Amino acid sequence: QTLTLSPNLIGFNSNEGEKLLLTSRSREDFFPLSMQFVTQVNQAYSGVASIIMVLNSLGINAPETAQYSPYRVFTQDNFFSNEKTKAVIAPEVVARQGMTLDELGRLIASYGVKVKVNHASDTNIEDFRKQVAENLKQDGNFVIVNYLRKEIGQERGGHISPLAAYNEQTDRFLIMDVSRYKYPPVWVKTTDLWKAMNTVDSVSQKTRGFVFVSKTQ
Amino acid sequence: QTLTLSPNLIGFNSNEGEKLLLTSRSREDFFPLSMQFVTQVNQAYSGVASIIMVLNSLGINAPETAQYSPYRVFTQDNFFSNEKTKAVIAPEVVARQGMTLDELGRLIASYGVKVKVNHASDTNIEDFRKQVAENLKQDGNFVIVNYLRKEIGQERGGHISPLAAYNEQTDRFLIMDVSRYKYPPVWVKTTDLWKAMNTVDSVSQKTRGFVFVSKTQ
Ligand SMILES: N[C@@H](CCC(=O)N[C@@H](CS)C(=O)NCC(=O)O)C(=O)O
Ligand SMILES: N[C@@H](CCC(=O)N[C@@H](CS)C(=O)NCC(=O)O)C(=O)O
Ligand SMILES: [Ca+2]
Ligand SMILES: [Ca+2]
Ligand SMILES: [Ca+2]
Ligand SMILES: [Ca+2]
């Protein structure tokens, strides 16, 4: 039960979508993110799924729980075991209204990793293409985006999901969509994704945007 | 945050493992499996995680539950919502002792899908390489392997995980290891994987092996 993609998007679930990855020259992040790819456990945890993909990909030290002990890994359930994390915003609130861009950043920063929040309002499409594309060539850092689905031709509201690769020939980014029951990963034209982050989240009264994540040293 | 690999195995989490994928001509399965890649929810559910990766990739009509409704998708928690699945072996039993190859086959078949169970004792490495390598070239069917982790230099017992791709130059198979907190995906020599399948499961007193899955056309 997958939803159908608007003509403007190229699904990863297609030959075209696979070739956009095999031809892309900015994709170093796809392999680790794919290894950690996860379904948001409820329809408002897209930010939590996205964070744990990134933190697990960065290999930073993970929570110690009964679940997988002795093994340690970020999961959507144990992400909030960090008291500074709940302090930002409680899990039962995220389970209702999700998380804003600034909150996403603080929730990542609660685990001591380096974050840079970019509101669409404080930048422009060129430095986003330039900077994001650069990140996608490098290990040890990642990109998460927060965007209004409606503006790239999907249903519907604000979403969060990491990016895995950029296709230089088509000017499209690959979104590793954590709503896996709903949409496959899609290749979205920078034009559409920009429009999509350049939207005001009523919750924050601030624009959506994108966040760079890396380790502090 | 995983265990270190034995030298005989090339992790997907390396340059070597990444290009073993890019230079394989038997990999059509990797893309849809990668999109469904999950962590087994407890340390005995590797069979259940493997099945749902395959059923979700096959676009088998999925359970209808509250969790993701209106969207329909296989999860480890809703796989046993089908009464004939539970009849094969109860979730509470799988959660303790996992599943044998034979039970793996019957659990898949309980969803009306076409399954061919191959115990190692009734075939041989050469027809395993040939038939799996060709399944990895075709859409609409998938391969799950059951194997003793020791025989490939991993810790430790019988495991289950789907196969994504076969790299002809090296004669290695990519295991999409659902124990994601413990090991990354690994490229394992065909000979090594045969050794591991050709072992007797004390639970079944039968050899381990591999399973082909497809839609009932
Ligand atoms: N207020 C943020 C919320 C971002 C967010 O967390 N969205 C959640 C729902 S509140 C999600 O998981 N959505 C899945 C989807 O859009 O399909 C926004 O509008 O951008
Ligand atoms: N009895 C089967 C069990 C296969 C199985 O279900 N393994 C479970 C444990 S009982 C598992 O999830 N193992 C994870 C791992 O070995 O990494 C065998 O030995 O092959
Ligand atoms: Ca790398
Ligand atoms: Ca990067
Ligand atoms: Ca295909
Ligand atoms: Ca196949």
TrEMBL record, chains A, B:
Keyword ATP-binding: no
Residue numbers binding Ca(2+) 1: 15, 18, 28
Binding site for Ca(2+) 2: 28, 139
Source organism, top-level taxon: Bacteria
EC code(s) of this entry: 2.3.2.15
Keywords of this entry: Cadmium, Calcium, Metal-binding, Signal, Transferase
MF GO annotations: glutathione gamma-glutamylcysteinyltransferase activity; metal ion binding
Peptidase C83 domain sequence ranges: 1-217
Sites where the protein binds glutathione: 40, 99, 146, 149, 158, 182, 208
SUPFAM superfamilies tied to this protein: Cysteine proteinases (SSF54001)
Protein name (database record): glutathione gamma-glutamylcysteinyltransferase
Phylogenetic lineage: Bacteria, Bacillati, Cyanobacteriota, Cyanophyceae, Nostocales
